Ligand binder design. Sequence first.
Ligand SMILES: N[C@@H](CCC(=O)N[C@@H](CS)C(=O)NCC(=O)O)C(=O)O
Ligand SMILES: N[C@@H](CCC(=O)N[C@@H](CS)C(=O)NCC(=O)O)C(=O)O
Ligand SMILES: O=C(c1ccc(O)cc1)c1ccc(O)cc1O
Ligand SMILES: O=C(c1ccc(O)cc1)c1ccc(O)cc1O
Ligand SMILES: [Ca+2]
Lengths: 241, 241
Amino acid sequence: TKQITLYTATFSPYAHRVRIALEEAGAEYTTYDVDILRNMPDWFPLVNPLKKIPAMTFGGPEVPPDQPSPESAKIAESLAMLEFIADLFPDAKLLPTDPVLRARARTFMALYENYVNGQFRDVWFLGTPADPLLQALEMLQGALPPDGGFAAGEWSIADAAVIPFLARMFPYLEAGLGLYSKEDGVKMRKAMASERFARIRQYVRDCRARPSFANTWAGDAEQVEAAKTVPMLRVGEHHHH
Amino acid sequence: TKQITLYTATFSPYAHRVRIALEEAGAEYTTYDVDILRNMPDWFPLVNPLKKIPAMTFGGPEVPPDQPSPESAKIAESLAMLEFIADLFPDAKLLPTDPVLRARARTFMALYENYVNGQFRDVWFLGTPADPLLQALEMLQGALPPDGGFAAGEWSIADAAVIPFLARMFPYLEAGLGLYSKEDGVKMRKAMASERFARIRQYVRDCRARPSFANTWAGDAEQVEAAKTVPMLRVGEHHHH
Ligand SMILES: N[C@@H](CCC(=O)N[C@@H](CS)C(=O)NCC(=O)O)C(=O)O
Ligand SMILES: N[C@@H](CCC(=O)N[C@@H](CS)C(=O)NCC(=O)O)C(=O)O
Ligand SMILES: O=C(c1ccc(O)cc1)c1ccc(O)cc1O
Ligand SMILES: O=C(c1ccc(O)cc1)c1ccc(O)cc1O
Ligand SMILES: [Ca+2]
């Protein structure tokens, strides 16, 4: 019964993770956009002292999201929100019940967070070399069940954690977004269309086909435009190695 | 009934996390040391293809740890193992039952992994300036309940995740182990003894006082000697400015 408010931004893959889980849970919830990278409201540190999107409030009296209540619980960090939503909506089975299959989901999230995410960040925002990102993506692909299905078999929050980043990769590459070189752009586009990455392409299609993705995605072109508002994606800058 | 084998190393804070949780669970389990950084056994990629410690096998036939069975479940990533042990031993209450308090536990783990661990790595392995690490520790300290207790109130896996790193900090500093300069070593020792950090000292004492720590710690001097075997800690080497 307690209210859920998610503070979000269209460009943000971290916020996207939590919208997907809330959709899969069938939750009632409010979203409120925050211009976190160019014009943070003065009240925003009340919902997240770290000044990051996403932010979540839970419970407390019903109030406008720009008038946050001190009585609501303030939850930070997208992966902690994913586990929270699973805990709140057990009947939605957002994690397996088998402990080993649950561990597959948790391991997949850790593999993404510890080895892949930083490579997406460094290639796109610093223009570091693409080969380590492709190696990390092949490792992640290797953890998927080979015959099809999601990270832990049935869909889980592990797939909410990862699809925002993988689904952005393809249209960002096609639009030439990112500080990496022309040569590394060609390399990544060829690699991601090659047989080496067939399995992760199927995974991306399977995740994108679910309503939870459709209903939380602005469209490829529109997401590309939101990403162009990110200050660190300085247009006309490229790094070469 | 299903066997647990943890592949370990004394120097490793990541392995230490999991030993602490297994002790708090009252689990029956085997530990097997692996010289992962200097002389990895050729069978080790059968239990963890990432070639990292810790590694875990679960179930399958009882076999010597250096003869792992392909029938056992292979579990990687220390935080996934922590959540796995909580799932396996629900009566041990390794997480709260209340969803909001569970989320405090998960947020505290994410704060450490996302903002603190990489600063420890920079300072100790690269000798980068200490101020960003002290800032990150002050943030983590701020997430603790100010009047006492563990990260989520009662002890949880969040405290297993973090105490291996905080507990190494003080004796490593006293030994001057790590690539930072004497000047930054003095600065960190003074800061960690000052009233600014009284709350995190109380937290370290409170975690260390539990049997799960005593039974998984070699002693300060012994832990320092094991850390000196870590190539990346470059014993006798320091970077300046
Ligand atoms: N680990 C955080 C990362 C969130 C994050 O980095 N969000 C970006 C937007 S995509 C942000 O808010 N940046 C503002 C800042 O860093 O000051 C999470 O998983 O929720
Ligand atoms: N995210 C991993 C980190 C494990 C890790 O980095 N272990 C180190 C020593 S404590 C290691 O085994 N390194 C071997 C390697 O990187 O190849 C975990 O949480 O379990
Ligand atoms: O730009 C990215 C990004 C995300 C996924 C991907 O496949 C390529 C680039 C990004 C990554 C993290 C973030 O907080 C914001 C971002 O815009
Ligand atoms: O050297 C460390 C370490 C751990 C805790 C601390 O307070 C300072 C340094 C270390 C050693 C091994 C490793 O795999 C990771 C590490 O951060
Ligand atoms: Ca595989």
